[PDB]
């Protein structure tokens, strides 16, 4: 499809100070909380691993993965995680209030596509 979206809690854990949330580069870890990082990170792989387990109650996600009921978009050629936006997985900016605007008249001419030449990717998915 051209279109996906999704309410957290998403898969959350840390490689080399990089958190990452649905598989996308959320935040970094620095001075005291790369530790927690490091510990968080092996708790993920025990978890999802060896006990193949992936409650929360296992994992014990600190707050560095953000809200835990945040909301994903993904279009052809970007996603929006939160009120963030990536591009071929890497960070590019918060979302502006035009940049919400878009999302939703996307949203909306999806639906108008779905109840009928399908929308183009939101603007800011390029550059």
């Given at each position: 499809?051209?279109?996906?979206?999704?309410?957290?809690?998403?898969?959350?854990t840390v490689k080399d100070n990089q958190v990452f949330?649905?598989?996308?580069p959320?935040t970094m870890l620095e001075?005291?909380?790369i530790?927690?990082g490091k510990?968080?990170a092996?708790?993920?792989?025990?978890?999802?691993?060896?006990?193949?387990?992936?409650?929360?109650?296992?994992?014990?996600?600190?707050?560095?993965?953000?809200?835990?009921?945040?909301?994903?978009?993904?279009?052809?050629?970007?996603?929006?995680?939160?009120?963030?936006?990536?591009?071929?997985?890497?960070?590019?900016?918060?979302?502006?209030?035009?940049?919400?605007?878009?999302?939703?008249?996307?949203?909306?001419?999806?639906?108008?596509?779905?109840?009928?030449?399908?929308?183009?990717?939101?603007?800011?998915?390029?550059?």
């Open positions: 499809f051209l279109f996906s979206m999704s309410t957290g809690p998403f898969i959350c949330v649905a598989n996308l959320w001075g005291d909380d530790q927690v510990e968080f092996a708790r993920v792989e025990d978890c999802t691993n060896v006990k193949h387990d992936m409650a929360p109650t296992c994992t014990k996600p600190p707050p560095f993965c953000g809200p835990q009921d945040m909301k994903m978009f993904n279009f052809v050629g970007c996603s929006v995680l939160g009120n963030k936006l990536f591009i071929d997985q890497k960070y590019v900016r918060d979302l502006t209030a035009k940049d919400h605007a878009e999302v939703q008249t996307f949203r909306e001419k999806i639906a108008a596509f779905e109840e009928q030449s399908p929308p183009p990717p939101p603007s800011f998915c390029t550059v």
